[PDB]
Ligand binder design. Structure first.
Ligand SMILES: Cc1cc2nc3c(=O)[nH]c(=O)nc-3n(C[C@H](O)[C@H](O)[C@H](O)COP(=O)(O)OP(=O)(O)OC[C@H]3O[C@@H](n4cnc5c(N)ncnc54)[C@H](O)[C@@H]3O)c2cc1C
Ligand SMILES: Cc1cc2nc3c(=O)[nH]c(=O)nc-3n(C[C@H](O)[C@H](O)[C@H](O)COP(=O)(O)OP(=O)(O)OC[C@H]3O[C@@H](n4cnc5c(N)ncnc54)[C@H](O)[C@@H]3O)c2cc1C
Ligand SMILES: [Cl-]
Ligand SMILES: [Cl-]
Lengths: 415, 412
């Protein structure tokens, strides 16, 4: 036996793109390439489903901007994937609370040269105190902004990149699209191309440890039916995120970067009904940001509705799922009712629903000193590859950037 | 608050039947009952699938006998599950060694034994000749040293394909018509309607005694850490999963020692039933080559079933690539029927399943209780591996009666 020239652990968008660059290179003519992923389907945090077979939903990544994510758009085009307009870029009720924050973030703006290391909360509290800063930050519907490990300078960035709140900063001309059939369509297209150029996949295997071994490396993997397996290879990319790196045999992060990394969890839930009852309220294609636990509420045409939350509120919803389905559904009815200013009895019960919880939905770096796109083990020559090593940490575009640099460091290992 | 009065970990046939007996009991009125299992669906080593919209298949347990398993045959009827005749009760195309096989088994049966069946069967016959005839029976457990020659005659006599090699050719074999999934769903529906709550997809990592009750660590299959407090606790899991836990198994439970061996099944559907041309439907061939047992089910499909070292052989091919695995099957099919490879079609669809611990058993003649109790904490462990019927669903039912009785005791 079980052996290869090059091995990529991780069949997310980073690892699949790594494989695509390598196989396009003359200097790999004739080499063998093996790809492992601990899951049954490629994709990582890209996961499309069919909700009640009536419409495609995105349990993971769902949106991209041509302004922010041009390599991603070019990937969509190269693989003939249809894009559709993403509507949730405005509010039917931008509150004065929001436009106050627009006015207070621009007012406060010329201070981040000196103070931008402070937490975003500690920052905004300098305008109209702290109770007013909480009401303003909370109206943006992304509870990660309260975390002390989120600085003020990196908060202004977060706000400008997300489509619901991007007009609070002068980043409002950006456009947004979604895959018309599901982002899994792109994943399958790259996967087919890499397979047809001779790669071989072993989906369902988890890497456990790795030891350097002469000129190559010996990897210990475990199948999800318990079958133990050993693989030998001469060149190794780990296209996994930092949290998974930290639980391996290598010296991460000390011997790799120096910097420290964190992560926050994400939760999304979708509900279908027999009738599109929100059309009477003129809510199709709209998004509401509320202070109750659903945080962001989305109505998608005829088709369905969903909510999307993060950090402490993600953990809240996943506790309800653990206390039982009825009750989870029933607290959605309560909070939907108050978001619309009506009584629980006007909100029907769903036919079918789906949810997903990501223990490490988004992983980021906690510095910047100039951090490179992909990393290299100080001692063994293993290469790491993650969205979390780029300026686009938290976005698919970040995966494609790190893949290009990572696949270039390994090309020079090969000459 | 995340807690219960009673907790059962394991939603195989043992765990669900444990829950079924408890909710039937008057002494459990008022009390709360929570069932965990690490899989997303219930049934353990019972697993029914649909290969092609055509037919349902058994990735795990597939057959029972009314004579050998009266309680299982009774569960089927208590839940109104239709049965069907299991055809693979006869080796219609015997090989030379089959004929000698009945004769030597009745011939060696005097010798009192408890020794490894390979060394024994080669005591009164040539060693290279014993390998020839043991292997004609199609189950490579029979070559393991950890299996006595006593154990081996009990194995030959209870499997539908070689039972006529003993004076047991008169047992009947049945399969489920819609799959044993239908028996699992029946018990699950009952236990849920009496008010039990399922947390499927959670895996128990450890357990700690805590005052009068116990405190459980669980991990969801998406990472969510969980803690559950209960007062009474059944662990309806096999020994191999007892060993990976917080508790001192087996040292502090039985003082016996247990083993296991792995199993593999593979199913193939085609465009046209090419095997009828050989008068081969509803028939089973035992061959020497890696497929070890080849079954032909009417028009619908063929499969193969192997154990122990051959089970690892096939799981190996799978890890080297789906293609070529299919080509191994196609080479070995050709030698089994004695034709060239190019006459054997490739299949439309196929499914396989590998069971790292397919069957687990006890290594002793400890005249083995049906369920166990932890000397100190009062935790009860439930498994087919503790009974005379280990490796059979009937043992899960028997271990369940006992485990729920030891618990109903302690509740008063
Ligand atoms: C809720 C949510 C919403 C999102 N929304 C957006 C959005 O709208 N726009 C956008 O651009 N991005 C979004 N993202 C991010 C997007 O999912 C990208 O894929 C992500 O930024 C990085 O992809 P990746 O290939 O680097 O890593 P991953 O997709 O995380 O892939 C890593 C893979 O390696 C595998 N793996 C890990 N560890 C091991 C091991 N020890 N052995 C073997 N195999 C292993 C994993 O199974 C995984 O498949 C969202 C993410 C989440 C969770
Ligand atoms: C290939 C194969 C063929 C078979 N053919 C037959 C046959 O024809 N006739 C027959 O009678 N029997 C057959 N069997 C055996 C039959 O499947 C078993 O005897 C019976 O199902 C065992 O029931 P059980 O509840 O004791 O254990 P299991 O079926 O093993 O259920 C145990 C459950 O505990 C769960 N679990 C384990 N550990 C943990 C943990 N730490 N946390 C949470 N949950 C946990 C598991 O997910 C599992 O669901 C076959 C088995 C195999 C593998
Ligand atoms: Cl996002
Ligand atoms: Cl069996």
């Amino acid at each position: 036996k079980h052996s290869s020239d090059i091995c990529i652990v991780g069949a997310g968008i980073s690892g699949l793109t790594c494989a695509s660059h390598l196989l396009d290179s003359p200097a790999c003519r004739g080499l063998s390439l093996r790809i492992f992923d601990m899951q049954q389907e490629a994709g990582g945090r890209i996961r499309s489903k069919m909700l009640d077979g009536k419409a495609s939903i995105e349990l993971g990544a769902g949106r991209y901007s041509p302004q922010l994510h041009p390599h991603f758009q070019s990937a969509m085009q190269h693989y003939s994937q249809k894009s559709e307009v993403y509507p949730f870029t405005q509010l039917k009720f931008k509150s004065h609370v929001q436009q106050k924050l627009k006015r207070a973030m621009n007012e406060l703006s010329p201070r981040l040269k000196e103070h931008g290391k402070e937490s975003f909360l500690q920052f905004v509290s300098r305008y109209q105190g702290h109770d007013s800063a909480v009401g303003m930050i909370r109206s943006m519907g992304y509870d990660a902004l309260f975390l002390p490990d989120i600085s003020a300078e990196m908060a202004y960035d977060i706000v400008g990149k997300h489509p619901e709140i991007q007009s609070v900063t002068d980043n409002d001309a950006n456009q947004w699209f979604a895959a018309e059939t599901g982002f899994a369509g792109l994943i399958q297209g790259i996967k087919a191309k890499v397979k047809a150029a001779g790669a071989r996949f072993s989906l369902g295997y988890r890497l456990l440890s790795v030891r350097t071994d002469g000129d190559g490396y010996l990897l210990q993997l475990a199948g999800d039916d318990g079958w133990k397996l050993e693989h030998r290879t001469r060149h190794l990319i780990l296209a996994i995120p930092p949290s998974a790196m930290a639980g391996l045999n290598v010296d991460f992060p000390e011997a790799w970067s120096g910097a420290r990394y964190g992560s926050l969890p994400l939760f999304k839930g979708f509900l279908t009904y027999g009738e599109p009852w929100w059309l009477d309220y003129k809510l199709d294609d709209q998004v509401l940001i509320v202070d109750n636990p659903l945080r962001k509420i989305y109505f998608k045409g005829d088709k369905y509705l969903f909510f999307y939350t993060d950090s402490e509120m993600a953990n809240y919803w996943r506790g309800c799922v653990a206390e039982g389905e009825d009750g989870y559904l029933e607290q959605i009815r309560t909070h939907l009712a108050s978001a619309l200013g009506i009584v629980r009895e006007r909100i029907p019960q769903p036919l079918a629903h789906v949810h997903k919880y990501w223990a490490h939905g988004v992983e980021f770096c906690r510095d910047s000193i100039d951090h490179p796109s992909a990393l290299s083990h100080r001692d063994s020559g293993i290469i790491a590859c993650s969205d979390a090593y780029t300026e686009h940490c938290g976005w698919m575009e970040g995966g494609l950037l790190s893949a290009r640099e990572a696949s270039r460091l390994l090309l020079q290992r090969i000459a």
